[PDB]
């Protein structure tokens, strides 16, 4: 060992000198080892201990040079010396590879654990000698440099990477990386970001804070990749999120309301992106959104006032504007989340069915009525022919509104009645719109309801074909079925008597066995009155025709009543229209009052449309149809109760109510007192009875 130790030490000193290394010297140094080792009982000869002693004092001498350096110099010193030591230790391990082959491996096999390979020995000696004193200073230098980088200045990224790599490699794994660097790094992150957020929120607005936080998070994510280990992604991400977003959730919630007050789509999207990172943090935002939409809807409806009660268009347009605005907000800022669309739906379903208009009408059924009137106004002939593109979108939006209405039966009844009136009188703006509306109602409503509408259109077609065919045999006549159309049923003037018989004979001849009941309250036409001092014309109803044709002077109401056999209640109403048109002279009327004709009537244009609807007809119609709906509701409730009892013999009261509501949910929301009253009636009808004992339980009785 002594014969080769001096030259071996001289050679090893050359390796650690970090200079040009002769290849011949390498093989000579390797040759020394073979002679030293070769001569169980393996020949160790404490060469391992000798090289351990050699490596010990060298690192102490190296540490003497750099023990007093400041923050800036220690990084460069540690990086350079660590790189040189790693390279030289690799070379030395290459030189002494023979020992690791046999004797190092035998020592581990024998069970002794106080040993390591030459490279591992060099690393452990480094950790024990140089790392222990300088670790705190190096870590503090790295932290100061990182803090300098965070403030805007540019730093040398190569210094930190070497320190991180040296810390990672010394774990002989990341046992030493976390204990000496990562904990201090995370504590410094806490200390820096808490103060940064507190100072930033005090001066700058909350809106820019979201951008600042997202930029800081992206910067951290990039920085860890650039000059840190890849095992701290989740740790740093969650710690930074907790520091930045979680602590200020209260001010975030307070801001959200203001950002709702004035539309800021990008800001709301940024807040949603930031809060989504924290688990279980979006619920309160959903509650605020629901409440805000509800309050906005009621505020918008209240603004219109008493005019909206009789104006369907403004009411529907207000509802649609609110819905469109908040749907755009949900679909753009909140990225079509299920919770937010649910919040929109819940708020809409509440402010549509209950608002100021319904309170005035004292019933919740006014909204479907207004919707039906708006659709009918859209689909009538007006002074302006609608565009195809705009009408379809409005019909789509109306169908969107119809989904939130709990009382759909009122809408169905009103729409069917108005469509029947439009079809009879031939006043439809466009047929394609009607076809599209029926196609939509087919998907949105039941099958029994749509068959009624299809029957009306089939009747209209077969009647137009009949009229076209009969024109060749020879004034328009419409023949309708007795069940499909919702119309409920006078002396025919001699002026049109011939046409009556002419049409009746043809109808009887073409088809027999049918009785034709003639309706004169739905018949229109035009007048030719010679006894008017002018050559003019006036569109009028059949009742108005008979009233005008009779005077061709002054007559008593009783005389006219005898002449036309018209009931006085409707006679006064039809006469008031003529008086309101300034075509008669005597608001009140008397049975014996005399009515004359104002000769030389002056009008802006000859063509005057005196077929104005009566003052009370609309109100009477609304009350009648509301009473009819109320009457029809009871039958459905009774049928549902009977059919649910028929299959389940014994059932409880609460379960009964819950099942009836889900049975009738697609038409209306039943009231509990009505259901209780219907059950009481069914009991009196001996359809079911209550079992003795076990109160609040019903059983089916045959």
């Amino acid at each position: 060992l002594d014969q080769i130790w001096d030259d071996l030490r001289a050679g090893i000193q050359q390796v650690y000198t970090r200079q040009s290394m002769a290849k011949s010297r390498y093989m000579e140094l390797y040759t020394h080892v073979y002679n030293y080792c070769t001569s169980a009982q393996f020949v160790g000869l404490e060469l391992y201990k000798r090289l351990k002693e050699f490596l010990k004092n060298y690192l102490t001498n190296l540490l003497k040079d750099g023990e007093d350096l400041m923050d800036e110099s220690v990084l460069k010193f540690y990086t350079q010396q660590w790189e040189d030591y790693r390279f030289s230790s690799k070379v030395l391990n290459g030189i002494c590879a023979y020992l690791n082959r046999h004797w190092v491996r035998r020592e581990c096999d024998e069970g002794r654990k106080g040993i390591y390979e030459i490279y591992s020995l060099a690393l452990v000696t480094w950790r024990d000698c140089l790392f222990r004193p300088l670790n705190k200073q190096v870590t503090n230098a790295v932290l100061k440099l990182i803090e300098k980088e965070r403030n805007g200045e540019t730093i040398n990224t190569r210094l930190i990477s070497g320190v991180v790599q040296s810390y990672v490699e010394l774990g002989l794994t990341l046992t030493v990386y976390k204990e000496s660097f990562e904990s201090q790094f995370l504590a410094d992150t806490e200390r820096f970001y808490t103060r940064e957020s507190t100072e930033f929120l005090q001066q700058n607005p909350v809106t820019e804070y979201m951008k600042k936080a997202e930029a800081r998070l992206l910067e951290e994510q990039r920085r860890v990749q650039v000059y840190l280990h890849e095992s701290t992604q989740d740790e740093l991400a969650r710690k930074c999120e907790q520091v930045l977003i979680e602590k200020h959730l209260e001010i975030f919630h307070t801001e959200f309301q203001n950002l709702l007050d004035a539309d800021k789509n990008e800001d709301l999207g940024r807040m949603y992106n930031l809060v989504s990172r924290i688990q279980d943090g979006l619920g309160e935002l959903k509650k605020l959104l629901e409440t805000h939409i509800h309050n906005q809807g009621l505020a918008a409806i209240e603004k219109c006032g008493e005019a909206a009660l009789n104006d369907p268009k403004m009411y529907v347009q207000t509802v649609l504007d609110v819905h469109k605005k908040y749907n755009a907000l949900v679909m753009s800022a909140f990225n079509n989340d299920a919770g937010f669309v649910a919040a929109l739906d819940k708020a809409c379903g509440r402010f549509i069915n209950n608002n100021a208009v319904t309170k005035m009408a004292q019933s919740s059924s006014k909204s479907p009525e207004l919707l039906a009137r708006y659709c009918d106004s859209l689909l009538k002939k007006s002074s302006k022919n609608p565009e195809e593109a705009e009408l379809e979108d409005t019909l789509n939006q109306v169908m969107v509104v119809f989904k939130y209405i709990e009382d759909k039966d009122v809408f169905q009844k009103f729409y069917a009645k108005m469509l029947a009136k439009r079809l009879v009188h031939q006043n439809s703006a466009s047929d394609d719109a009607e076809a599209s509306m029926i196609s939509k109602l087919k998907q949105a409503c039941g099958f029994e309801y749509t068959s009624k509408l299809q029957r009306m259109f089939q009747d209209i077609g077969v009647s137009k074909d009949l009229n076209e065919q009969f024109k060749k045999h020879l004034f328009s006549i419409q023949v309708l079925s007795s069940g499909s159309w919702p119309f409920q049923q006078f002396a025919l003037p001699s002026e049109l008597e011939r046409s009556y018989q002419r049409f009746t004979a043809f109808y009887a001849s073409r088809h027999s066995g049918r009785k034709l009941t003639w309706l004169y309250q739905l018949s229109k036409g035009e007048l030719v009155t010679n006894c008017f001092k002018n050559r003019y014309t006036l569109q009028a109803s059949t009742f108005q025709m008979a009233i005008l044709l009779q005077y061709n002077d002054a007559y008593t109401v009783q005389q006219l009543t005898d002449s036309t056999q018209i009931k006085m209640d409707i006679l006064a109403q039809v006469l008031q229209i003529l008086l309101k048109s300034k075509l008669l002279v005597l608001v009140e009327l008397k049975p014996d009052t005399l009515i004359k004709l104002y000769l030389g009537y002056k009008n802006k244009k000859l063509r005057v449309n005196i077929n104005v609807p009566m003052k009370t007809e609309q109100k009477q119609e609304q009350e009648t149809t509301h009473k009819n709906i109320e009457e029809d509701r009871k039958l459905l409730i009774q049928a549902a109760i009977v059919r649910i009892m028929k299959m389940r013999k014994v059932l409880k009261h609460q379960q009964l109510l819950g099942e009836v509501l889900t049975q009738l949910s697609s038409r209306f929301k039943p009231r509990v007192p009505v259901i209780k009253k219907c059950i009481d009636i069914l009991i009196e009808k001996e359809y079911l009875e209550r079992v003795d004992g076990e109160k609040d339980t019903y059983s089916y009785l045959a």
């Binding site: 079925s481 046409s499 034709l516 229109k524 035009e526 030719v528």
Partner: peptide, 11 residues
């Protein structure tokens, strides 16, 4: 002049 009328037919 021109007259438009409506009627219902039943068996």
């Amino acid at each position: 002049k021109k007259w438009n009328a409506v009627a219902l037919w039943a068996w």
